[PDB]
Homo-oligomer: A and B are copies of this chain.
Amino acid sequence: LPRDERRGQLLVVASDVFVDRGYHAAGMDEIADRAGVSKPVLYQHFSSKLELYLAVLHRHVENLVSGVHQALSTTTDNRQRLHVAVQAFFDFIEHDSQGYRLIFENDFVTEPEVAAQVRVATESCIDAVFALISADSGLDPHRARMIAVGLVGMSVDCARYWLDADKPISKSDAVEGTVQFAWGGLSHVP
């Protein structure tokens, strides 16, 4: 596939500008200059500020979804899958500060295009966990989906607490605590 290196450079700068300034104050002139290109060159890659914003959101969502699916699809047992998938989520939120704000701390949810890019994403990650959990479980499929929702919720909320509290314990202790809790439940917390 032909690599549009100028597109990727633009998405990187646009991610920072949108997060740092907010959607309203962010401008195409600011984004072009940050990338070191003229505004007409920016328009040869993106049609509008909204199409660029949606491409930025899509890039961060794709990175999260692909990271999670790669964890689920490149492991052979339940426990291993849990370890690698929890790790992948902590890695995403720690390593993609822009992606984290755009997906999880987003105010600009007033328009359907943005809200859809997040709601289709969350459901796809839950679908994947559900596919793995339901297989040879003997569970009613709705109970299996309920568990997948709970498992994703428990993992996301633990990770978000850790990041939002400015990493009060090491990343390793947070990952270990989250995995141990997801695997053994409250019965094995002590």
A residues contacting B by CB (< 8 A) are 78-79, 82, 107, 109, 133, 136-140, 142-143, 145-147, 149-158, 160-162, 165, 168-169, 173-174, 177-178, 181-190
Whether B138 and A181, one on each chain, are in contact in the complex, defined by CB atoms closer than 8 angstroms, is no
- Complex contacts, A181 vs chain B, CB 8 Å: 146-147, 150-151, 185
A160 to B155, CA, bound (A): 16
Q: Are A137 and B187 in contact (CB under 8 A)?
A: no
With beta carbons under 8 angstroms apart, the residue of B149, B162, B187 that contacts A183 is: B187
Residues of B contacting A139 in the complex (Cβ-Cβ under 8 angstroms): 189-190
Q: How far is the CA of A189 from the CA of B185 in the complex (A)?
A: 10
Where chain A touches its partner, the secondary structure class is helix
Closest CB of chain B to A127's CB: distance in Å?
13
A149 touches B161 (CB 8 A): yes
Which residue of B has the minimal Cβ distance to A144?
Answer: B189
Return A165 CB to nearest CB of chain B, in Å. Answer: 7
Contact yes or no, B147 A177, CB < 8 A: yes
Question: In whole angstroms, what is the CA distance A158 to B140 when docked?
Answer: 14
A115 to B173, CA, bound (A): 29
Tell me, rounded to whole Å, the shortest Cβ–Cβ distance linking A83 to chain B: 11
Least distance between A189 CB and chain B CB atoms (Å): 6
Question: What residue of chain B has the Cβ atom nearest to residue A147's Cβ?
Answer: B181
CB contacts (< 8 Å) of A190 on chain B: these are 136-139
Please pick, from B78, B145, B185, the residue contacting A184 in the complex, using a CB distance under 8 A: B185
Q: How far is the CA of A139 from the CA of B186 in the complex (A)?
A: 13
